[PDB]
Design a protein around this ligand. Structure first.
Ligand SMILES: *[C@@H]1O[C@H](CO)[C@@H](O)[C@H](O[C@H]2O[C@H](CO)[C@H](O)[C@H](O)[C@H]2O)[C@H]1NC(C)=O
Ligand SMILES: [Pt+2]
Length: 158
């Protein structure tokens, strides 16, 4: 009468689940900041446009011509995407999101390569003047380990 065998099949499938669980824990999280990166990129057409027609970066959502409260640009895992001086920053939700990324953010910003803009993707940044941004790392930035290698630009990137 065989408990042992079953206890072994359970034992071997449960240390493997334990072993797999970190990887998929990290997998899911990269899939949830993907969305953040995609809600932020939607907005570059409008920021680019605004800068190009005028020489000034859009001050906010309403200058840039996108839904004026940031909370209207939201997703399954993102709460709000916000244009603040041409820099667009996406904040992750704090529900349905992995705890090491809940409520955290990234930013996309551009630089003028006179005639067009050049875009960057990375951890949050604040615009200091029409051509420099500075790190806005306040402790709520998405960790480097969950950002795609396409979205790893430091504040001074070019
Ligand atoms: C859109 O972005 C512009 C960047 O150059 C801002 O000036 C603009 O604000 C100006 O226009 C609004 C219109 O209601 C207000 O008069 C501000 O006081 C002006 O500075 C900005 N628009 C908004 C709604 O902030
Ligand atoms: Pt205008």
């Amino acid at each position: 009468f065989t408990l042992i065998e079953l206890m072994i099949v359970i034992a071997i499938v449960g240390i493997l689940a334990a072993v797999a669980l970190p990887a998929y824990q990290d997998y899911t999280a990269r899939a949830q900041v993907s969305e953040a990166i995609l809600l932020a990129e939607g907005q570059k057409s409008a920021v680019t446009e605004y800068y190009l027609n005028h020489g000034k970066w859009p001050e906010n959502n309403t200058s840039a011509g996108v839904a004026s409260p940031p909370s209207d640009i939201k997703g399954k895992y993102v709460k709000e995407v916000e244009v603040k001086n041409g820099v667009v920053t996406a904040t992750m939700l704090s529900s349905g999101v992995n705890n090491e990324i809940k409520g955290k953010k990234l930013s996309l910003w551009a630089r003028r390569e006179n005639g067009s803009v050049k875009w960057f993707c990375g951890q949050p940044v604040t615009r200091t003047d029409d051509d420099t941004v500075a790190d806005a790392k306040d402790g709520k930035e998405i960790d480097t380990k969950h950002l795609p290698s396409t979205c790893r630009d430091n504040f001074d990137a070019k």
